[PDB]
């Protein structure tokens, strides 16, 4: 019937989704025709978000539901099976997210509980857990990562690792991977006055000035820019605020560009002007 | 019996039947919710709202890349642009002489472009001096022409001879001008037409002292046999008795050729010279031509008007703009800051993203200074379209833009491994 | 072909329209059905704007054009025949606007040479015209009549005879009727980029806190306002900006709503929240 | 004696350097003038490969 989530494999070659059916549907897209390829199912609840991760690993795809379970599904040859899960937390999971592929092959998820497990891989079948209780008031709806930011000697460096995450107290939280091996809150953010829906993290397009974009049920879309000159001051600015609330938000690559999904049925696209005011660039549908 | 869940969980969740969604994808597409896909999964695409013809062809991006010289990065292999000799002229060929972009680029190579003699004399007072004039010719030679069917037809019109020779003139065409006076029983005008070329103060004030005193009871006199000796005072806008009037049915283009031919007011630099006419007239709005002019006039201010007019209007196609400030600072033209170069080169290298010519991306985005910030898009561009920018595009595209064995391997060996699987 | 504007009548029976084609069709639109009834062609150019004078006076409906000249077609008896004409300004006239009725019967127009004439009428068929000389730069295009306003005696109130009207030099003057005869220009306001487009005098709901709107070719639409009566204070705020020029602006008349007509073909409305932000109620077409 | 045309030609041509003398041509520039005769007197050592049109003009320029 309806779908919630759904989105495109790197290299675009597969399109998978999911629905309210508990069926997690893996379509291919070869020439623009969709083609299905498998239906796995296996959710006591209706699926929320789902993401692909990155092809150095493999051929890996991870959804959450509201059944408070998260599924990974790899595939060798075909052979679609799913080589983990992870119950960890009580309630509903609205969102996954995997880190930029250097980080390692980390996944994050923000569950209803107001906690956020993230998941970290080992040599084998073998998944570590770092959980972050309490993280949101009422619980957590979106969670995006941080941008993989490099920082003589033979090593690969040792970043920032930081990770956004909206949720249900109005409060659009950052993370940071605390040089012992927690994470902790770097900083909050107030300006919506009733639930964050989502929380994109632009990625950077080798530009410093890194964004976040934020939407929630009082209708507004904010775009926190920063200017991190080594102290968090995220200065929020209104995009648009439509009577009906937002639902998701996301960056288009290379020129920063917001499809806006919310309001009435409807999705719009904007870019930032060379005025600084953000404009609505067309209607879609 | 199952429909409660669907109803408790979508109101314990604070969703309306009202939810829809939308997310851009690796590839620049958007996955939109329609009903139209097997799966309700509407995979529109993102318009390439950058419209010119020549860029989709091989030949153009493939030739053009002969007039560059590539070279790495002072701090990673990752290649950028030595020396590029591009020009306006370039791209001509490839358009057709009826579009304003004809124009617009014609127009460009002409102020931009630099000129040249084709003999080695040294006398940089000489070599100096004519450069200055080859522009000033080529330039004014141009309007005659985009003026040629305005005032032409406009002279099939007149019952005045005098008013006639007063209309060639207006478009610097001495010879027939003069004719005309002679052949008229206007003769003393063919003379004064024969000094107009020149710069001679005797005549200059002649004309002038002349002027004043036909402001004195003495009516009866053409407007157009005063206009002319205007012609000869030397600044005939700022006048005693002014053409400022013109501006009522003669292209603003037609008044600024007169500013170029009669008005040399004072013997400086032309680009400051343009820079006068703007002053004394309004411009067409929405103007390419008219813009690109400002740019041309504003010397050193050159960034900070472009600047300042990109940010009230859309007539300057991304692809010019980026043209521009990479065949101004190519050949010491102008004045362009790094920051406002790679800001519009990431403009450009974006749209040809769009478009999938990856080909072309790339290549732009060699025109990018921040080594981080090139390294980091070209890693990307080539990391998720090797395919595409293998076997076939003309079979070598990278090796040709001195890009890194390494990462070629790297994010071809990634792919393969892909697609293993898949199999 | 196209039209450019068309006015509903005063207790809404007729519907007068005007065209590029110089042709000012009056329809009548019983129960929802249109229905022509005369079609007073006299323009040498397309025609602009067009008003219906107050029934107080008759029918009266003015109509001015390219044509540099303004026409009002009085009706007797369905003698639909031009009382007056009036040629008073050199360039084309972009805009006419009646003056709230208890002024009497004032017409003002604003050509685009930078004029403004001010047809008052008197006993019979006269016309007196108080005008005004370069009242902006370089034309202008919209003129809004302030609504009217009252001030122990047998005395009809003397009123603030305001007006306003945006124009081609980014300008939006507002203006006043001198106690001793000529108007004057009470104020500016500069806050569009180009050229403005119109300019809609808010009617007020009684309402002190009198508002005004105004769109122009930069794409945003301006609701500039007054915080109390006598401080000469207008305060904008910006209702929305999109990439493309507005073209007209109107108010709903109980609730304040404002229809923007520009951008895409698209017209949307607009409704100010109990925040103060101005938002999208809905999407017409 | 037609300059005019004279020059709207030799820009067509893609022989614009010429346009620019033809417009010294109808006055008097000892710079010019120089320029030309100098010029002239280098063309008749190993270099007699130039079009007898484009020497014809310079020589228009000489005096």
């Given at each position: 019937d309806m779908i919630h989530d759904a989105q495109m494999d790197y290299y675009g070659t597969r399109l998978a989704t999911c629905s309210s059916d508990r069926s997690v549907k893996i379509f291919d897209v070869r020439n623009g025709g969709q083609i299905l390829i498998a239906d796995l199912r296996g959710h006591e609840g209706p699926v929320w978000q789902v993401a692909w991760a990155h092809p150095m690993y493999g051929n890996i795809l991870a959804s959450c539901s509201y059944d408070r379970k998260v599924i990974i599904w790899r595939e060798?040859?075909?052979?679609?099976?799913?080589?983990?899960?992870?119950?960890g937390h009580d309630s509903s999971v609205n969102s996954v997210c995997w880190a930029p592929h250097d980080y390692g092959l980390i996944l994050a998820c923000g569950s209803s509980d107001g906690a956020i497990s993230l998941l970290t891989y080992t040599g084998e079948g073998q998944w570590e857990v770092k959980k972050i209780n309490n993280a949101h008031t009422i619980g957590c709806n979106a969670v995006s990562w941080a941008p993989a930011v490099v920082p003589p000697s033979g090593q690969k460096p040792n970043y920032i690792k930081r990770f956004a995450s909206g949720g249900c107290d109005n409060l659009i939280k950052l993370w940071k991977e605390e040089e012992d091996g927690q994470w902790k809150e770097e900083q909050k953010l107030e300006a919506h006055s009733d639930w964050v829906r989502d929380?994109?993290?632009?990625?950077?397009?080798?530009?410093?000035?890194?964004?976040?974009?934020?939407?929630?049920?009082?209708?507004?879309?904010?775009?926190?820019?920063?200017?991190?000159?080594?102290?968090?001051?995220?200065?929020?600015?209104?995009?648009?605020?439509?009577?009906?609330?937002v639902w998701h938000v996301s960056w288009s690559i290379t020129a920063n560009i917001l499809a806006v999904s919310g309001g009435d049925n409807k999705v719009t696209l904007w870019k930032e002007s060379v005025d600084g005011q953000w404009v609505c660039i067309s209607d879609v549908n | 019996d199952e429909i409660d869940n669907a109803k408790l969980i979508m109101k314990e969740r604070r969703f309306t039947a009202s939810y829809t969604f939308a997310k851009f994808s690796t590839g620049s597409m958007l996955l939109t919710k329609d009903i139209v896909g097997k799966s309700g999964v509407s995979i529109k695409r993102l318009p390439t709202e950058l419209q010119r013809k020549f860029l989709f062809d091989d030949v153009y991006l493939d030739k053009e890349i002969e007039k560059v010289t590539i070279e790495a990065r002072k701090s990673n292999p990752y290649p950028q642009i030595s020396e590029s000799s591009l020009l306006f002229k370039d791209a001509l060929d490839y358009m057709e002489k009826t579009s304003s972009d004809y124009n617009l680029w014609k127009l460009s190579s002409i102020l931009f472009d630099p000129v040249s003699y084709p003999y080695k004399t040294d006398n940089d007072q000489v070599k100096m001096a004519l450069l200055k004039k080859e522009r000033h010719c080529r330039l004014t030679s141009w309007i005659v022409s985009q003026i040629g069917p305005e005032i032409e037809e406009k002279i099939r019109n007149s019952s005045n001879e005098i008013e006639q020779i007063f209309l060639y003139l207006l478009l610097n065409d001495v010879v027939r001008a003069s004719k005309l006076a002679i052949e008229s029983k206007n003769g003393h005008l063919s003379v004064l037409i024969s000094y107009l070329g020149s710069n001679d103060p005797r005549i200059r004030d002649l004309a002038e002292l002349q002027l004043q005193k036909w402001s004195t009871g003495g009516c009866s006199i053409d407007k157009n046999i005063s206009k002319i000796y205007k012609l000869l005072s030397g600044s005939p806008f700022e006048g005693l008795f002014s053409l400022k009037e013109l501006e009522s049915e003669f292209s603003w283009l037609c008044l600024l050729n007169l500013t170029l031919c009669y008005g040399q007011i004072d013997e400086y630099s032309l680009e400051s010279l343009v820079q006068s006419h703007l002053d004394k007239f309004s411009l067409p709005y929405d103007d390419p031509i008219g813009v690109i002019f400002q740019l041309y006039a504003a010397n050193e201010n050159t960034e900070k008007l472009y600047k300042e007019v990109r940010q009230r209007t859309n007539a300057l196609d991304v692809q010019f703009c980026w043209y521009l400030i990479q065949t101004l600072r190519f050949n010491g033209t102008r004045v362009f800051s790094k920051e406002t170069s790679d800001?519009?080169?990431?403009?450009?290298?974006?749209?040809?993203?769009?478009?999938?010519?990856?080909?072309?991306?790339?290549?732009?985005?060699?025109?990018?200074?921040?080594?981080?910030?090139?390294?980091?898009?070209?890693?990307?561009?080539?990391?998720?379209?090797?395919?595409?920018?293998?076997?076939?595009?003309?079979?070598?595209?990278?090796?040709?833009?001195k890009?890194?064995?390494?990462?070629?391997?790297?994010?071809?060996?990634?792919?393969?491994?892909?697609?293993?699987?898949?199999?």
């Amino acid at each position: 019937d309806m779908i919630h989530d759904a989105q495109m494999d790197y290299y675009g070659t597969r399109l998978a989704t999911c629905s309210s059916d508990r069926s997690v549907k893996i379509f291919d897209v070869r020439n623009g025709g969709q083609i299905l390829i498998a239906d796995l199912r296996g959710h006591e609840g209706p699926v929320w978000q789902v993401a692909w991760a990155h092809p150095m690993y493999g051929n890996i795809l991870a959804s959450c539901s509201y059944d408070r379970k998260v599924i990974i599904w790899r595939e060798e040859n075909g052979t679609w099976e799913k080589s983990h899960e992870h119950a960890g937390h009580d309630s509903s999971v609205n969102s996954v997210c995997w880190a930029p592929h250097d980080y390692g092959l980390i996944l994050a998820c923000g569950s209803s509980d107001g906690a956020i497990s993230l998941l970290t891989y080992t040599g084998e079948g073998q998944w570590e857990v770092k959980k972050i209780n309490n993280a949101h008031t009422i619980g957590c709806n979106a969670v995006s990562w941080a941008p993989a930011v490099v920082p003589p000697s033979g090593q690969k460096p040792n970043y920032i690792k930081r990770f956004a995450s909206g949720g249900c107290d109005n409060l659009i939280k950052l993370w940071k991977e605390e040089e012992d091996g927690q994470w902790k809150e770097e900083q909050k953010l107030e300006a919506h006055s009733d639930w964050v829906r989502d929380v994109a993290w632009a990625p950077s397009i080798g530009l410093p000035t890194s964004t976040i974009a934020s939407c929630s049920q009082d209708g507004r879309v904010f775009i926190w820019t920063c200017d991190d000159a080594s102290s968090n001051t995220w200065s929020p600015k209104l995009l648009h605020k439509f009577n009906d609330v937002v639902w998701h938000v996301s960056w288009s690559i290379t020129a920063n560009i917001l499809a806006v999904s919310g309001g009435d049925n409807k999705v719009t696209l904007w870019k930032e002007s060379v005025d600084g005011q953000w404009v609505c660039i067309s209607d879609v549908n | 019996d199952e429909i409660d869940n669907a109803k408790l969980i979508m109101k314990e969740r604070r969703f309306t039947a009202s939810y829809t969604f939308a997310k851009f994808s690796t590839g620049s597409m958007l996955l939109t919710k329609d009903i139209v896909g097997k799966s309700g999964v509407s995979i529109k695409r993102l318009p390439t709202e950058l419209q010119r013809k020549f860029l989709f062809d091989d030949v153009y991006l493939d030739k053009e890349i002969e007039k560059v010289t590539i070279e790495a990065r002072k701090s990673n292999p990752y290649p950028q642009i030595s020396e590029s000799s591009l020009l306006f002229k370039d791209a001509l060929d490839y358009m057709e002489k009826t579009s304003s972009d004809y124009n617009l680029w014609k127009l460009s190579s002409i102020l931009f472009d630099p000129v040249s003699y084709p003999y080695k004399t040294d006398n940089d007072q000489v070599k100096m001096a004519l450069l200055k004039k080859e522009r000033h010719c080529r330039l004014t030679s141009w309007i005659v022409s985009q003026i040629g069917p305005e005032i032409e037809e406009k002279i099939r019109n007149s019952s005045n001879e005098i008013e006639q020779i007063f209309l060639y003139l207006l478009l610097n065409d001495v010879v027939r001008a003069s004719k005309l006076a002679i052949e008229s029983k206007n003769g003393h005008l063919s003379v004064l037409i024969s000094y107009l070329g020149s710069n001679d103060p005797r005549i200059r004030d002649l004309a002038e002292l002349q002027l004043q005193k036909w402001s004195t009871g003495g009516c009866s006199i053409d407007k157009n046999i005063s206009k002319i000796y205007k012609l000869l005072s030397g600044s005939p806008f700022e006048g005693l008795f002014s053409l400022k009037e013109l501006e009522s049915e003669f292209s603003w283009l037609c008044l600024l050729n007169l500013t170029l031919c009669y008005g040399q007011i004072d013997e400086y630099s032309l680009e400051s010279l343009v820079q006068s006419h703007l002053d004394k007239f309004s411009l067409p709005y929405d103007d390419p031509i008219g813009v690109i002019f400002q740019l041309y006039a504003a010397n050193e201010n050159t960034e900070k008007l472009y600047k300042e007019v990109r940010q009230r209007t859309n007539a300057l196609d991304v692809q010019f703009c980026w043209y521009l400030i990479q065949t101004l600072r190519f050949n010491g033209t102008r004045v362009f800051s790094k920051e406002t170069s790679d800001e519009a080169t990431f403009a450009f290298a974006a749209q040809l993203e769009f478009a999938q010519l990856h080909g072309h991306s790339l290549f732009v985005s060699c025109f990018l200074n921040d080594d981080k910030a090139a390294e980091d898009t070209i890693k990307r561009l080539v990391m998720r379209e090797i395919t595409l920018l293998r076997a076939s595009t003309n079979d070598h595209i990278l090796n040709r833009l001195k890009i890194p064995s390494q990462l070629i391997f790297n994010a071809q060996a990634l792919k393969d491994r892909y697609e293993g699987n898949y199999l």
